[PDB]
Amino acid sequence: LDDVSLTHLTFGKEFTEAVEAKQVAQQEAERARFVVEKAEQQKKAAIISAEGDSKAAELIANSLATAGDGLIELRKLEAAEDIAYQLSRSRNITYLPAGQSVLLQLPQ
Amino acid sequence: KAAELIANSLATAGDGLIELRKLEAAEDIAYQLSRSRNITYLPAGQSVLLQLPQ
Amino acid sequence: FLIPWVQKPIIFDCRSRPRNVPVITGSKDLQNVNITLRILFRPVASQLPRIFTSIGEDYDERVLPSITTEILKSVVARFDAGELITQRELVSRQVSDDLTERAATFGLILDDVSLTHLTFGKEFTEAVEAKQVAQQEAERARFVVEKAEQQKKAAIISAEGDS
Amino acid sequence: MVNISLRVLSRPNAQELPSMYQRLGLDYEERVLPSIVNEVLKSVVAKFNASQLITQRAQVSLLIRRELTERAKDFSLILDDVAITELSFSREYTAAVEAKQVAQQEAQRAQFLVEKAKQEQRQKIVQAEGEAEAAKMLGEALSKNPGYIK
């Protein structure tokens, strides 16, 4: 015997049902696992962000220390400007009126 | 668990780590609490089509 | 006037002719570098008898590849791959002077020596591309800095103006 | 089981030809090469795990090259190059490539996020510095009297 293999485990009606059932259930499993791992991803993102800020703060502090007090002061101003902007973010521009089309008659 | 991990990470990352994560979160919250975006502008208007005689 | 069977003129061309010698050499970093040296040189007119007797008619083929390969490898070994990109002119000069010194012994004068196509070919594109991207980002960073300065300046002037 | 196709470029050593003819015959390439190659390939491959074959392939190819060269030399054959081509399973190869593609992309995206975070951090510092110096400049500028500041 070179090889022996089972082929077509069925019957026909159930064969279709079987494949279909398999697909749906497996998708459900897919969803479950995917959602958990993604939750982990968000978990990670949050951690990295926190550490990122952390390092940023360290660097900023270091930079301001080098740049002196003056450095700190206007960083504070920038931040205040940012905060103020966020507090109120909106504005509009005014224009004078435009016109509409009309027909021109040329004089004789 | 995220909280737990963050706490542990902060511990390894030291004090500096916690401080700016705190500011990050604060900015995030402040951001959402007041969110909106506006745009700068460029003024303009149509022009005229004039035929010149030749 | 010549005596026909007795003597034979051997006519050498004094004109400068380009010769490209491809050479594969390693840098200090042990990186493989493909460089093709472009050499323009001609014979010294007074030395022709000497060149013919010593090396021969084909002296371009015999001497050039040898000395060029020797010198180029010796020079290249000194610098690392990164230097070769930035420093190319310096390397070319150094190769030029050392080559000229060596060439003179044989009675050859080199008009110009230049490194051409530092590669490989895949490397041409990769290297240029990489540098390009880096340059774009760096320059954009430049724009950022400049723009920040301009805004700071504008702020100062505005305050002065309001003042 | 691993299916691998080895490609080899070879030439006979010009000095040894008489020995080649006496020992092997004219048919030297067909008789010697398949045997030596299969033997060495099997011997080398046996040492590494499947996972290594994928990541490590350059290492394995060099190892086979060196071993084959040594063996070939005794035959008076010179090998210019030896490289492994097509490492595979039928279906498994396809799946393998897909898996690699996906993993690579995710990893790169991960770096995108990290890099961007770095960039934002830098921007924040630079702006803080900028404001700072702007403040300093403004203050100094005020020297144009208090009317200036007003």
Coordinates of C-alpha atoms in Angstrom, one line a residue, chain A residues 40 43 46-47 49-58 60 82 86-87 89-93 98, chain B residues 1-2 5-6 9-10 13 16-18 20-21 24 27 30-31 34 36-41 43:
Chain A
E40 CA -4.4 43.7 25.0
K43 CA -3.8 47.9 27.0
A46 CA -2.1 53.0 26.9
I47 CA 1.0 51.8 28.7
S49 CA 1.6 56.3 25.9
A50 CA 2.0 56.8 29.6
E51 CA 5.6 55.9 29.5
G52 CA 6.0 58.1 26.4
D53 CA 4.6 61.1 28.2
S54 CA 6.7 60.1 31.2
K55 CA 9.9 60.3 29.2
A56 CA 8.7 63.4 27.5
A57 CA 8.3 65.1 30.8
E58 CA 11.7 64.0 31.9
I60 CA 11.3 68.6 28.9
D82 CA -2.9 75.8 24.0
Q86 CA -8.8 74.2 23.5
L87 CA -11.1 75.8 26.1
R89 CA -11.9 76.6 19.8
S90 CA -14.0 78.5 17.3
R91 CA -14.1 81.6 15.2
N92 CA -15.4 82.9 12.0
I93 CA -14.5 85.4 9.3
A98 CA -21.3 89.0 -3.2
Chain B
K1 CA -5.1 44.5 34.7
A2 CA -4.2 47.5 32.6
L5 CA 0.4 46.8 34.5
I6 CA 0.7 50.5 34.3
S9 CA 5.5 49.8 34.5
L10 CA 5.6 53.1 36.3
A13 CA 10.1 53.4 34.8
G16 CA 9.5 60.4 36.0
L17 CA 7.4 57.8 34.2
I18 CA 4.4 58.3 36.4
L20 CA 4.2 62.5 32.6
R21 CA 1.8 59.6 32.1
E24 CA -0.7 62.7 29.3
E27 CA -4.3 66.3 28.6
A30 CA -9.0 67.9 29.0
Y31 CA -9.0 67.3 25.3
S34 CA -13.5 70.3 25.4
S36 CA -13.6 71.0 18.7
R37 CA -11.6 72.1 15.7
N38 CA -11.5 75.3 13.7
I39 CA -9.7 76.4 10.6
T40 CA -7.7 79.3 9.4
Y41 CA -9.0 81.1 6.4
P43 CA -9.9 85.5 1.7

